[PDB]
Design a protein around this ligand. Structure first.
Ligand SMILES: C[C@H]1O[C@H](O[C@H]2[C@H](O)[C@@H](O)[C@@H](O)O[C@@H]2CO)[C@H](O)[C@@H](O)[C@@H]1N[C@H]1C=C(CO)[C@@H](O[C@H]2O[C@H](CO)[C@@H](O[C@H]3O[C@H](CO)[C@@H](O)[C@H](O)[C@H]3O)[C@H](O)[C@H]2O)[C@H](O)[C@H]1O
Ligand SMILES: *[C@@H]1O[C@H](CO)[C@@H](O)[C@H](O)[C@H]1NC(C)=O
Ligand SMILES: [Ca+2]
Length: 496
């Protein structure tokens, strides 16, 4: 459960948040495969409640109605097609598994679902699965309201409702089986792993019981004995009775301290500075690298919906975001996930964005098609961070330097640092308020390299900055603090 199951040489996955199955199928063939991406996180593929007030928010997808592969992203046939095509070009699919609960208890009964399924929250009836009152933790939860009231109580966090979401009785073999039924259907379809949503609200042991019921990956695309990749969403920052280390036995975990700390260091908040990143990783009190799934932002905190707070960097802070993603992709710690979002009308009031609920680009509820512009960018309000030269190229950089050790670190005691990955790559950052001009030991073989942030190495030439490495591996770097992208990166494959 610790291996991503990506084919040899691909080191990252991208979250194509809210994308339609058909657009992802195309993306695998026309971009992801060619550009070297390892896989994709898809939004929950199972049927959810259709919420019209507000109008189809993104979070209505974390409010399950059944396990039918039928959502605004597409039906089951489109889903299978997508998984097939993507696998056929070596790009894996990872399903966002929402198994801790069903919908909110206050939701009106009826057939307001993405697939017409009938559900009745008030009476605990989800006939499409089916589930009834006996399958929820109502009698087990001890809070007066029935919802989680105190996170300092590990029991309560697991047995009570997360903001009213009907909590499933995961200790029951029946419920465990209905969930494994769902997951094995996906596995046999060809998916390579799962993101276990809200794993903090499930007992480590109940999760393990469910994983024991799972098949090995589809033998038509994966070698015999392959177990699905499992990453647990567990938000573990400061003091709480629950620790992310309690889930190491089921798979990897989301290391949220990563994006929070990186955000403040790069924002230079409260005395933080890049020079402190020398011992980035476990040295900062993070989980072990082989159990970590890292990222700069995720669908929740990029809109202030989770831990990380104000320090989190997102596409809205483009300049510093590229720098953070750059550092992440260059550094060896953990397994990296790149975010790919859509624009929404941020409307800040008293410091809070009242439009954080807005769902994906759409026409009367119908999600918009991802259109590709002549410059490879996207239209219809899809941000497509994964298509940004600086990010796309750093995804490739990670692939090239994969396995190479961290070395040749340099820092001016402030905000301009540099380090390399063995003799396969080197990167330099200037985050100070003054220019950076200096000759640094790079550890790369002599030659002329194309900087992959400012340009590309296209047919014998660089479209951007060029770096010259001498015989002793030295090379000169000059980065004005006024550069659009205050950092340079070169690797074995960008050498002319
Ligand atoms: C959001 C976050 O809260 C905790 O995170 C805690 C953290 O553990 C704690 O330590 C401290 O930091 O506070 C955090 C915030 O509560 C969990 O530990 C963590 O697992 C969870 N994140 C995952 C799971 C859910 C829930 O199904 C998703 O939520 C998403 O779906 C929910 C269900 O539709 C949404 O609620 C929505 O529906 C409810 C229905 O009753 C409403 O009452 C609620 O007002 C409305 O916003 C929520 O806004 C959205 O973010 C989310 O996309 C996904 O990433
Ligand atoms: C690089 O570009 C120049 C023109 O700017 C051209 O003279 C040169 O031949 C090109 N090199 C290759 C290898 O195509
Ligand atoms: Ca629970």
């Amino acid at each position: 459960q610790y291996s991503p199951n990506t084919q040899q040489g691909r080191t990252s996955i991208v979250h194509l948040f809210e994308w339609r199955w058909v657009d992802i199928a195309l993306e695998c063939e026309r971009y992801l495969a060619p550009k070297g991406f390892g896989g994709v996180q898809v939004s929950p593929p199972n049927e959810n409640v259709a919420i019209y007030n507000p109008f189809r928010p993104w979070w209505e997808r974390y409010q399950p109605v059944s396990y039918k592969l039928c959502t605004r992203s597409g039906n089951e046939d489109e889903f299978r097609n997508m998984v097939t095509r993507c696998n056929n070009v070596g790009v894996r699919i990872y399903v966002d598994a929402v198994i801790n609960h069903m919908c909110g208890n206050a939701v009106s009964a009826g057939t307001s679902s993405t697939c017409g399924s009938y559900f009745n929250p008030g009476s605990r009836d989800f006939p499409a699965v089916p589930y009834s009152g006996w399958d929820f933790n109502d009698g087990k939860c001890k809070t007066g309201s029935g919802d989680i009231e105190n996170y300092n109580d590990a029991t309560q966090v697991r047995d009570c409702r997360l903001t009213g979401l009907l909590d499933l009785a995961l200790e029951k073999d029946y419920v465990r089986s209905k969930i494994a039924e769902y997951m094995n259907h996906l596995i046999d379809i060809g998916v390579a792993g799962f993101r276990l949503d809200a794993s903090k609200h499930m007992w480590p042991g109940d999760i393990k019981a469910i994983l024991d019921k799972l098949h090995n990956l589809n033998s038509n695309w994966f070698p015999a004995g392959s177990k699905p990749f499992i990453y647990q969403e567990v938000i573990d920052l400061g003091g709480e009775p629950i620790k992310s280390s309690d889930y190491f036995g089921n798979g990897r975990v989301t290391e949220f301290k990563y994006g929070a700390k990186l955000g403040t260091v790069i924002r230079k908040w409260n005395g933080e500075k890049m020079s402190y990143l020398k011992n980035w990783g476990e040295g900062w009190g993070f989980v072990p690298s082989d159990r970590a799934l890292v990222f700069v932002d995720n669908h929740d905190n990029q809109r202030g919906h989770g831990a990380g707070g104000a320090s989190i960097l997102t596409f809205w802070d483009a300049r510093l975001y590229k720098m953070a993603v750059g550092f992440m992709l260059a550094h060896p710690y953990g397994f990296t996930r790149v975010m790919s979002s859509y624009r929404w009308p941020r409307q800040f009031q008293n410091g809070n964005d009242v439009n954080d609920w807005v769902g994906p680009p759409n026409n009367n509820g119908v999600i918009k098609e991802v259109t590709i512009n002549p410059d490879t960018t996207c239209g219809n309000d899809w941000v497509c961070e994964h298509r940004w030269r600086q990010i796309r190229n750093m995804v490739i950089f990670r692939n090239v330097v994969d396995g190479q050790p961290f070395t040749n670190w340099y820092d001016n005691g402030s905000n301009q640092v540099a380090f390399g990955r063995g003799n396969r790559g080197f990167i330099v950052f200037n985050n100070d308020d003054w220019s950076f001009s200096l000759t640094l030991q790079t550890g790369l073989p002599a030659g002329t390299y194309c900087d992959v942030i400012s340009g590309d190495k296209i047919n014998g030439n660089c479209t951007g900055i060029k770096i010259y490495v001498s015989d002793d591996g030295k090379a000169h770097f000059s980065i004005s603090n006024s550069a659009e992208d205050p950092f340079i990166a070169i690797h074995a494959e960008s050498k002319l």
